Amino acid sequence: HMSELSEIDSVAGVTIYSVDGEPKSFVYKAGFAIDADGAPNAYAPNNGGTDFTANGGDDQGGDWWGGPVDAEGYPIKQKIFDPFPGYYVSATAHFNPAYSEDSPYRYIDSNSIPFIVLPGNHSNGAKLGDVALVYNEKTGDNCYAIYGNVGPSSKIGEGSVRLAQALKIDDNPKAGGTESRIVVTLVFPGSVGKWETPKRWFSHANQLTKAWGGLSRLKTLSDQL
């Protein structure tokens, strides 16, 4: 059965719809850019990371948005007890408060955690840590994910390296992702709104998805978008 959809927002030519009914959710069909933010091997001096260093900004004291910086504006380098010593600490907007701002463990590791990015100013009621169901209409693959980072306000359709793997999308931060609008993202705003273990939020995503009607309902909905 088709779903009843009501437009709530629009970004970069992609319409965002409230899905009428309960539990509360919104949905959009978009491409999928790779966000390697939070991965502890994303950024390093001299293009040593999985992304080119300049994709995080200027690592010589200029504008650097890839992660935290020291008192002179240079990116914080990981320590001997961090996953990739000497690489830069890459940050995500969602964080684990158990760890300090200079720690890679504070941020969501894009390599290991399925997460979506929502455009800045376009969260549509979702809070970081809320859960989502993500579906690739071309591969039939799906995955639960958290809202883990905030993207440019003018860009939509983006998520983590691990989410790309789960969806069978090229996961390479330098050349992966897709511009084809093949990914359907169903967000449950208000579902979590805090950091918690992946086992816990994945379970909650599973319970919400079951209550909502399951992947079968999202598959039918995908044909409407």
Three-state SS sequence of the chain: CCCCEEEEEEECCEEEEEECCCCCCEEEEEEEEEECCCCCCCCCHHHCCCCCHHHHECCCCCCECCCCECCCCCECECCCCCCCCCCECCCCCCECCCCCCCCHHHECCCCCCCEEEEECCCCCCCCCCCEEEEEECCCCCEEEEEEEEEECCCCCCEEEHHHHHHHCCCCCCCCCCEEEEEEEEEECCCCCCCCCCHHHHHHHHHHHHHHHCHHHHHHHHHCCC
Whether 136 and 187 share a structural domain: yes
> Which residues is 151 bridged to in the sheet?
119
- Structure-block tokens of residue 173: 């931060």
Number of domains making up the chain: 2
Whether 187 and 96 share a structural domain: no
On whether the CB atoms of residues 195 and 207 are closer than 8 A, the answer is no
Length of the chain: 225
Q: Is residue 44 in a domain?
A: no
Whether 10 and 81 share a structural domain: no
Whether 98 and 67 share a structural domain: yes
**Range(s) of the domain holding residue 13:** 5-36+110-222
Whether 102 and 145 share a structural domain: no
Q: Which of 157, 161, 149, 150 is nearest to 179 (CA)?
A: 157
Listed in sequence order, the residues at least 6 apart from 89 whose beta carbon sits closer than 8 Å to its beta carbon are 40, 67, 68, 75, 76, 77, 78, 82, 102, 103, 104, 107
Listed in sequence order, the residues at least 6 apart from 85 whose beta carbon sits closer than 8 Å to its beta carbon are 77, 78, 79
Q: Is residue 45 in a domain?
A: no
Whether 95 and 134 share a structural domain: no
Whether 82 and 191 share a structural domain: no
Q: Is residue 202 in a domain?
A: yes
On whether the CB atoms of residues 138 and 169 are closer than 8 A, the answer is no
Alpha carbons 190 and 109: distance in angstroms, whole number: 23
Whether 103 and 64 share a structural domain: yes
Whether 119 and 215 share a structural domain: yes
Q: Is residue 196 in a domain?
A: yes
Whether 98 and 114 share a structural domain: no
Residue type, 130: D
